[PDB]
Amino acid sequence: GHRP
Amino acid sequence: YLQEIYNSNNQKIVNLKEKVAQLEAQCQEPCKDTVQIHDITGKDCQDIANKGAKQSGLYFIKPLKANQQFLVYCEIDGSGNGWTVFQKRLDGSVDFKKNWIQYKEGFGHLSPTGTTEFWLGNEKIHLISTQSAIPYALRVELEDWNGRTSTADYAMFKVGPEADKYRLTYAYFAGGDAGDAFDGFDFGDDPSDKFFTSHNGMQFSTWDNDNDKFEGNCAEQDGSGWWMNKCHAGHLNGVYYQGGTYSKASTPNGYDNGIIWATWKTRWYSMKKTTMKIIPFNRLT
């Protein structure tokens, strides 16, 4: 998904 | 008994030589291979359809700038449309954790029944989509573990040359009940989430060729070959998860790596079936  | 048998069975032997000669003639052909390739050829599957082909299966196509003809699976509907399928998922049969050259040259198998998973080469996709003036359209077809399916079309689909790491670009999302995941998704952690998860204009990346927007390696981590951007909202080349539902506890790195399309299903939901195919745009109205 995304990379916090 | 004297010679009344040194003849009876000396005659049998002449008929045996005869039937045996008959057997010989019936054992000269190879086993029958159920997978056959069709004769029609063209620049793409639409071109082949335009040439009267009637069924979906394996055909050789040879784009304009291609120096060698290659085999592809064509999907021909009764409507006279010819889709060139370049990606497929349906069971966890083929491993998609491949390297640059493998995603470039292609992997998996091609069937006439279209019941096999695969990844047509990146180079092949590039040669088809950019082969000429005419623009193409990409249709992403998904299916959950409940028999429900959805789609999403992208106009002016094109993949760049390897010199530009096979960058993906499209003019605009053309609609589809699956939603535009290539536009990114608002996961809610940081306002920049939707941006860093958009795919339009992204370069391709595998674990051994990092061209993403992440300081780390998205393809290495999520274990695939795909157009990463720190990292994704659409991951059709991700790990095949049986059941659909999965958690970060079952992932090797804690991040979602399944076959997701965030605008249709949660990221922790891997798709059951997946299809990526293109067709000249004018073919859609």
Partner: protein
């Protein structure tokens, strides 16, 4: 003087059984299946053992 015929019709059979065995196996790759079978060369030799001692 039939001995010159068995020193033939026996060996001929020895060549034929073998031929058919090979011929039949060669269909394993053309037809639905090949008859599983075995060739008894021994009995043929032992048949030519006494035919030889005599």
């Amino acid at each position: 003087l039939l001995q010159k015929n068995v020193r033939a019709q026996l060996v001929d059979m020895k060549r034929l059984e073998v031929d058919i065995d090979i011929k039949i196996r060669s269909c394993r790759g053309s037809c639905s299946r090949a008859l599983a079978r075995e060739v008894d060369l021994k009995d043929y030799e032992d048949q030519q053992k006494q035919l030889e001692q005599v």
